[PDB]
Design a protein around this ligand. Structure first.
Ligand SMILES: [Ca+2]
Ligand SMILES: [Mg+2]
Lengths: 497, 509, 515, 117
């Protein structure tokens, strides 16, 4: 349809208004002192949330160009918590500061392309310095320590996450379920996980977690490919139980009528080898087959699908692992070992018990967050929390080389942006003296920093204030990307009113 | 519907606003330094694109007269990337410069027709001079190099393009498909291709590749225009497992075949059959290759291993017809060559090439599906840039060839000052593509960069990605001659029409 | 006061509006087919005029920027006829040059390169205008030009030819309404100098813009001018008008008494340095007066004032007619001056003393025009004045073809103009198209829509062949009596290209704000 | 004394900026303001010629050494000392000192007091 087009600074200033509205709403919740935000509902009392992710999901602007920039930062900064599990709000605060000062220098006559080059070279050095000051996490004792800190000081949960990664490995599949009793226990079952998720967001059974869970579900494995009407006869045939259909190609009927079904993807000759393994696991049968005309739990994520507690014959399924094991000697061969590790590795299940359901769902939420944080701690390590690690990592900027003065400006844009998260931590405490608090932390060194929880200076590592290195480096990398994309945006196209 | 009519200068000034909005939006993406363009969507994040074709397709204006001038340049410039595969934004930048300077002189009193004549005489000589700078591409030695450049410096892709063009020839049918593994392969199979296309866009199976893919399909060949005998033979083929292809003079069959393809009834594709008695002879070649028979039952239908329906093209792959019967058809029309008039010579020789060479299938693969189809489409872009490069040759990229081709303007002849002004309109317009590439870098010194390139000669130019003057051919910066000359011919064509437009008729809001 | 400023294309476009308003109003009167222009008056019936000069004097605009461009081309074109209709031709030419000039500036032409190509084009057109010009010399040829400017009157043609024979070609000739009905010629003692009146309100006749004083007294003062009351009030009760010759608040006091009827005109002293005081003595001897200087006081005598019969003062020169000084003392100064010619060892002294000698010894030729009726007397007098002015200009630079044909023929010199680039060639072609404008306007004032063919038939013709708007026929304009002085034609083009080039190079226009 | 006319002397004198000391980046920015402003008089003189290309002329003058410059009257590149284009040293240095003085007061001005109309 007809379009309106904005160019040059008129587009970038309009985009900046949206970035500011997104950031200014979410950043008040940043630190441990993060202040409440009220979200209106259609009827009844409004929702009060200190969660910066919950606030960002509610941000929509009436102006199209303002909404574009607001969705740019929102989509990029959301990817920080998709992998590292934390840092969405931090990435948004950084993105606002980087784009503000960057655009401010564009008005002064700085080339936007050289600012991006200088910003990129500055991030490479800060991310590297974040690794130099990062503490590696290896061994079951300190893995339990990180799991306990992310559990809000729960030694039972820290030992549970450490024991799960001990049996199934650091890269193993670990899932969190609800226990049938008061006691919390760990159970290692059989299963596998692949990167093919749901085909539509409407299959999601849980609004906030964006996951589709099917309990006591039957698996349908075919190897032959969607919208063909022949699927209507097969769908209701065995439906009486949720169903998992696996193919390469019932959206409304699940969200409107009564049906429990999930259909994910299943490339080339490699896809035919994967579906034969799920048959020996899920306990079912897989071109030499019919036409379109069983596990305890099936969880469907956006980027992942995990089959938990599939029922095979343990004597027959053990032979399938030995068939692929024999194919390794006569064999690149790296993909054959991947399929072996999925079948023989299993899935760790965390059964979370408690007194009452309100406590059991409360305790389960901490185990999932502590698990996600511990997974990121074993990979890239841990760094000092409270926004201090971004300030300490500024020392790496000395190694950043600037080919001209505009590039040196971009380095200083990142230099001033690294201080912004801590500035917002202290600002959420309600004090106007926060400029002094930033000066003490910056003039100090090491793990010395400000803890906004007790409002006292201390050693944050010993105090239990820590962030995964993956969280911090991803927040800066994501923010610098989205802000540099907007700095280089010369046109904004949108539909007419 | 009642109409609003604009005349003379009032109409051309309004049309220029639409041409400006089109060009000013698309030209920011030109060159390696091309910047981002945000395209809004209903829900979610917008679309960031540095591609000029994506931005151009989204341009529509509220004012009908402004929208007309926008669609004018947009459609004419779109004919560049069709026969060429690149240079759509270049044609738009040239059209904006020719029309702006031309209209500027029209207000100065110059006759519009003498400007158009001067424009065409200048473009005629610039294309000729562009042919001298052209570097011909022939043989597997330099074809793999050209294919490697359009492959984003991948030598393995250039070897597949050079070897595929070696088996079936430069004009032979080459198709790129997704491989079943990481290792890329090449194989030549049976098949042919037709110059016709689908009747309705709804037959497309895969919207990503835009081509309708029917695997292990059936083919119906019928002479007259086609619901009388269709349904009995269609319903007899409705239970197959194999999709059906409809080949006739035309396809009532228009409404019923589209609604069944959109639903889950059956997969049916209709392609027109090329005219006169030559059409009835081509139906026998498709029937013998696929084993079927023409209709002038299920045993009469032909079977292939796959069918890909392009927009203007139709490709049948691996027909099931007996090879002993096909060779009897080959020597039938091959012996008919010795029996012949100057009328049909290469007409029957082209049919023999379809029943002999076949179709080569390029199979591209990678470690993950994300890179697999990303490199697969990269090969399709590399294959299209290579086939066009073989035809008209290769010229220096970065807009330098348009500047170097200005030497041919001395050969242009002007009958008066108005025509000479038109020649000078082209002279100033050829510098615009390079001036815009340097402007996309963001420097205010771009006026000096253009002076160095013009003061130099030959291969010397400016590389905007490294921001350093260097040899552009040795640095891998090249453009096909067909890409460059098409962008100049199409731009000068649309601007000449807009200069000669005395009225713009549009409906009332 | 606070100012508003317009820049470049915005200022040059507003200036063009004022230039067009002046041009379109005056150009309807151009040529013998010129049409009527009604000019309103405070009370009674308006003024109907076919004269372009009368219309141009009334052109004033509300918009200050538009008014500037109007007054710009108005003053520059006034120096062309400073008569002969050339002031309107210069305005028409100035419009065409400025219009096409601005049109190419928008097209991307450099304004200064257009000006260069314009100036080179004008030099070659004026040069070619000299070759086609036919000079006038001798009493016989002058008598023919005077008869033409008198509308086929051999009497005025002979009188002007005889007037230029008695006083010379460079002599001073004046026209005065005769006290008797017999037209006669009388040479009298007098002189003319290059100083005009010090204010337009001293002029007694608004039509000719010439201040004329009959039987007036001359006050000659050395220094600037309050303390003149004893001498000034002496002339007020003496009945004669007073002429004040001095070096220079008191100037406004004489303006009030002039408009109230209580005959005073002020003129600056001629020349400067010692030549000024030397010429002041020549005026006192011619008029029988005394120069106030260095043992004289301006407050202290009626005997020191010079006397003359008629004093005509325009905005340029002042002519003293019938000096009342004694004949012996006038020629005594002649011998005193001539004695210094042989005693001068410098070339500058000898050449400048001859100019001083030619004024006193030459005199002033007076043309007294008679007629049957007093109404016909002033009508015939104005005919002689215009005939004398046109004939005097025709002798200097020659004569060319009228009807705007000479400008068309002079276009053949444009091939001799060198253009350094395309923009300079454009300025040459601007003059090429502008030279057809005066004839195009003459044919347009006839009212015909066929004037596009008339211009082509004249351009494709040769020599003096052209179109006559009076009889609406093609003929030879030299034989038909249609001729313009070469000085008039070349001045119209030079002045038009001058003011049009200034406007093309104007990047800013400053004007006062609303009061 | 006398210096090069045509605004070239201010460009040739930019070599002294290497001797300027900056205590921080803000002071270094103020040094660069003069660096770009020294080219402004010559850039205006060339722009008053009406030429469409002003960048080439400024480039050829900045890269050349000595008194070599561009003559705007004849529109030709020539040595300005020999051609007769010359400015007094007091004229050139006073224009720079006065301009920087008034521009420094306006940059440091935090308030403007004016009467009510
Ligand atoms: Ca409500
Ligand atoms: Mg008249």
């Amino acid at each position: 349809t007809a379009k309106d087009i904005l160019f040059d600074a008129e587009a970038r200033t309009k985009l900046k208004v949206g970035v500011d509205k997104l950031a200014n709403a979410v950043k008040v919740t940043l630190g441990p002192a993060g202040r409440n935000v009220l979200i209106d509902k259609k009827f009844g009392a409004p929702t009060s949330t200190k969660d910066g992710v919950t606030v960002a999901k509610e941000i929509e602007l009436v102006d199209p160009v303002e909404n574009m920039g607001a969705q740019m930062v929102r989509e990029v900064a959301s990817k920080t918590s998709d992998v590292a599990g934390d840092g969405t709000t931090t990435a948004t605060v950084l993105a606002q500061a980087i784009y503000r000062e960057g655009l401010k220098n564009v008005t002064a006559g700085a080339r936007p392309i050289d600012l991006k080059r200088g910003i990129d070279r500055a991030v490479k050095e800060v991310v590297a310095e974040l690794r130099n000051i990062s503490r590696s996490i290896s061994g079951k004792k300190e893995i339990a320590q990180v799991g306990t800190i992310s559990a809000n000081n729960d030694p039972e949960i820290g030992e549970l996450i450490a024991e799960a990664m001990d049996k199934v490995g650091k890269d193993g599949v670990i899932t969190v379920e609800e226990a049938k009793g008061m006691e919390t226990e760990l159970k290692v079952v059989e299963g596998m996980q692949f990167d093919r998720g749901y085909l539509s967001p409407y299959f999601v059974t849980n609004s906030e977690t964006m996951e589709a869970e099917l309990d006591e579900a039957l698996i349908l494995i075919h190897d032959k490919k969607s919208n063909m009407k022949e699927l209507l006869p097969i769908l209701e045939k065995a439906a009486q139980r949720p169903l998992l259909i696996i193919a390469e190609d019932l959206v409304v009927n699940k969200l409107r009528g009564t049906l429990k079904v999930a259909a994910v993807k299943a490339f080339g000759d490699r896809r035919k080898a994967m579906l034969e393994d799920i048959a020996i696991l899920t306990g079912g049968t897989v071109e030499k087959g019919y036409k379109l005309e069983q596990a305890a739990r099936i969880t469907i994520d956006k980027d992942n699908t995990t089959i938990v507690e599939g029922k095979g014959k343990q004597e027959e399924i053990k032979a399938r692992i030995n068939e692929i094991k024999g194919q390794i000697e006569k064999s690149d061969t790296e993909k054959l070992q991947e399929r072996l590790a999925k079948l023989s590795g299993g899935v760790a299940v965390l059964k979370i018990g408690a007194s009452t359901e309100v406590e059991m769902k409360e305790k389960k939420a901490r185990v999932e967050d502590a698990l996600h944080a511990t997974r990121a701690a074993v990979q890239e390590g841990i760094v000092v929390g409270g926004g201090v690690a971004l300030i300490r990592a500024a020392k790496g900027l000395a190694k950043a080389v600037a080919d001209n003065e505009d590039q040196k400006t971009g380095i200083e844009i990142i230099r001033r942006a690294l201080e912004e998260p801590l500035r917002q931590i202290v600002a959420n405490t309600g004090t106007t003296d926060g400029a002094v608090v930033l000066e003490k932390v910056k003039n100090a060194e090491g793990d010395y920093g400000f803890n906004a929880r007790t409002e006292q200076y201390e050693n944050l590592i010993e105090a239990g204030v820590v962030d995964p290195t993956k969280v911090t480096r991803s927040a800066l990398e994501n923010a610098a990307s989205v802000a540099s994309i907007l700095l280089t945006t010369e046109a904004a196209i949108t539909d007419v009113k």
